[PDB]
């Protein structure tokens, strides 16, 4: 309950944004436009009644009255239609601002929220909530107050010409109506939540199946996905069908309470034909007044039903907005200043889950201007150090140091800009290859981009393409070949030119002859700055000065290439079979 | 225009599905429920008027009349609410069937449509269209005919008591109203299409940015995505703002034509106070009758506006449904029968685009029970043959033969089941690893799955996991390591056990010591059936009997390992530097 109150308060603050004085003029103009129509709408029946009465008692004068009636009809519609134009602008501006803020916060969220997300549920929630905000903004300003005022006016009219029992009857009817409506809305709130949960799951299942299109084409199991989607759609079918019947119960209950209220009103007055109310003029008055109470009352019931209905969909975003990143910067942060690349590890211990410990007692030092290569079993978690060094996941009980400085103390913005890393799996934007290669540094010019491709051994291949530097790379970089996709990612790091180089499985999908050229380029440019290369191939680690072997989360042997081969350790066995 | 007529005809056929006799009973019940309410609704004012007139001329009899008035009010609402329950069921069933058919056709579509799709536009279109069908189904059955009948009845009532000019005035007003409404709807149709196009682009851009989360976290360029999303949202803002004002023009035009029609009606009758219509009773009659014409007429205008509005969103799916796969099976197809794996190529020529030719004059033979390995430059397009052999893309001017049979003539279903391929890039479902490894063959039992993992060198690693055979693999298999993800894909092919094995970059992210065990398992199981291994590493091709070198789309050297080394060709140079 109090969570919804915070949601309404936050939305209300957006409407009354103090920064823009134009919005203040815009909102008050629409309100005055509504009250002007409401006053004129009341005046219209009075003008018509006066003309009819005057004509009955009795030409230019009726014509002017009929002309004035013409503008009155035009004026009532003119005020209403001209009112919604302004509020539409302010509501749409609020929609855009809220969507942009949600987008920014979603990208601000931590990595642990990702890698386990429901792809599709996020966009479905965003669309559903963005559709919901417009109605809540539109209805709240113009509908709640005038209807209550009209209800109060009609209540005062009915209080006039006291019947000494009609007030009690209508109070009881109103109380019963409110109780019934609140109970029905509270019951129906549960059904919408069940339907919403099923809809997101089907969408994310469909999107996952679409992502697995290559696998479901390689394997003949195509009907299984259709069957699962049919089951999810059947669940959504049942959830939606339950809601529709519940709506019919509310509508039937809506009429039955008013129908018996009208019946008991006519019965009560007919019971007093003699020794009581004897004027038949009052008989039509009570019927007309009750209808005049019914129409605004029915409008109020729809407004609350739609508001509580639309507010349920709103809880989906704002729960996501309350999510906070686990990793946060220190209250006092020092900018990262380094004159050389030195990395030190002091008994780092880290675990993805409390049950299993991946890293245990790993300690190594990276001298400035030197390259260190780590090799080992694929299950040893060698790449976890590279991910942890980038501070994707914070350390538990270990000390990590760069140039004699605390990485945790150092600001994240400064930390994530001095070093550059080549991803193990290359992902490319669905945009031009020129944009993909220029994403490394937007300040770079065309000459810098072209020379970077030459050292990546890709400019010659690009020159032979039908569209030089303009081919459209497909979704997730599927259109380009594996090797060329690998070369593109390396070119981004080359253009970025970071202080510390961290390549992860660089020469995996690359032929032998091109790898020799790439390694020579690395050993010339990266002489003055430290780098760390990780790869199972023995040829890339041979050139490195220092080689260590990591297995089962603990370092085994350290030293240069010559010492490792002589020691006849784990490294020697790996190189022996590779040479063959 | 005629395209929309086909769309309406297809939707109408779903409602009258001949297979289910229950639907026929369901639709006719609702129609009879509506006409019963309509007849009773007309009777209600007559009953009230009779009671008032009888009471004025003049108790148990009025009480029974008021009681009967009570059921009349209850009966009118009971028929209407009980009507919508059945049609909701049939409409939702139609929705589910249409969504399932669209899902199936989308997965039926060809590969060329994929790999260049707009991820997100598809789901947004599906959601928008699925929301649109319900209103069109609901409104068409119950709204078009009764409103026209009521309009005709009121037109006949106005034709009664001829004024000799009111019929002409109302005919002119109706014609002008229809012309104005059609013109406004035709003009507004363009605005909706512009808004719809912008919405899909923003969604697909956001989803692409979410997919590129790792890259936008590795590189500090985070604000660029927000700026692009803001620009797209601003375009959608402008497109939506243009629509809202156009709606206000229609509504203002709605009232002004009726307001002047009422004004000229009152002016015309007031002009004939003398020497004409002198009874003031007719003055209120024309006013009441005009309002009785106005309410159904306004309802008709809203129905057409909503129908033409919702039909624009419908064109999005049905254009996609008309899409047909480029590759189709032959009219007469023979089941694939083979006693051995023989593959023959006869001057195959294939090109992704007409500008560049990738494959030119490639001819090779794969003997039964033998393994052939191809190596070369990454840009030589060696993997295109494997993709083409699976008939993802049809050949242009080449002959491809399996066991002396035409692959094109052989049915696609039979062709895509005899052979199995390991993808170059491994994609895993967002489900349990047990389900991922069991996807190879649903008929396999638990024992077959467990023994398959042992030969994949992954059971030992899985046993040490916190959740044995129950860990949840993340989206696109990001949670698991590269090596373990590679091993999982191999286990699927092992469980499938196809007649022809085709591995693409199998031992890429795998340490040396595990690769020796895997290769030994391959050489024992795959002795009786042919296989093709492609990889840049020289150790995997050494064991193969026949080695060929493919560069620049043409074969260079062929023969066993010993002959290739002696020839001092391209293969010798590649192996020389690898040995070092
Ligand atoms: N997202 C994850 N969730 C659970 N366990 C993980 C995850 N990533 C890695 N591991 C564990 O870490 C080990 C591999 O570590 P990783 O850093 O992936 O090494 P590499 O990348 O060199 O294969 C595996 O045994 C696996 O169980
Ligand atoms: N989807 C594609 N669109 C355009 N060109 C492509 C596509 N896939 C491959 N190519 C071209 O084919 C060559 C690589 O072929 P490919 O079969 O990817 O070989 P490999 O997989 O061994 O790298 C590249 O030079 C590239 O230009
Ligand atoms: O040249 V490949 O992308 O098939 O390793
Ligand atoms: O063991 V790895 O997945 O970093 O090649
Ligand atoms: Mg490859
Ligand atoms: Mg790896």
UniProtKB/Swiss-Prot annotation, chains A, B:
GO terms for cellular component: chloroplast; chloroplast envelope; mitochondrial inner membrane; mitochondrion; plastid. Its main location: mitochondrion. The chain crosses the membrane at residues 28-48, 59-72, 139-159, 164-184, 247-267, 283-303. Residues 343-577 form the ABC transporter domain. Expressed at high levels in roots, leaves, stems, flowers and siliques. Induction: In roots by cadmium and lead. Disruption phenotype: Plants exhibit an enhanced sensitivity to cadmium, dwarfism and chlorosis, with an altered morphology of leaf and cell nuclei. Mitochondria accumulate nonheme, nonprotein iron. Decreased levels of molybdenum cofactor (MOCO) and reduced activities of cytosolic Fe-S proteins. Reduced ability to produce abscisic acid under normal conditions and in response to drought stress. Male sterility when homozygous. Residues 27-309 form the ABC transmembrane type-1 domain. The keyword Chaperone does not apply. Pathway: Cofactor biosynthesis; molybdopterin biosynthesis. GO terms for molecular function: ABC-type transporter activity; ATP binding; ATP hydrolysis activity. It is found in: Mitochondrion inner membrane. The keyword RNA-binding does not apply. Performs an essential function in the generation of cytoplasmic iron-sulfur proteins by mediating export of Fe/S cluster precursors synthesized by NFS1 and other mitochondrial proteins. Not required for mitochondrial and plastid Fe-S enzymes. Probably involved in the export of cyclic pyranopterin monophosphate (cPMP) from mitochondria into the cytosol. Mediates glutathione-dependent resistance to heavy metals such as cadmium and lead, as well as their transport from roots to leaves. Regulates nonprotein thiols (NPSH) and the cellular level of glutathione (GSH). Belongs to the ABC transporter superfamily. ABCB family. Heavy Metal importer (TC 3.A.1.210) subfamily. Homodimer. This is ABC transporter B family member 25, mitochondrial. It comes from Arabidopsis thaliana (Mouse-ear cress). The lineage of its organism: Eukaryota, Viridiplantae, Streptophyta, Embryophyta, Tracheophyta. The chain holds residues 117 to 716 of 728 of the full protein.
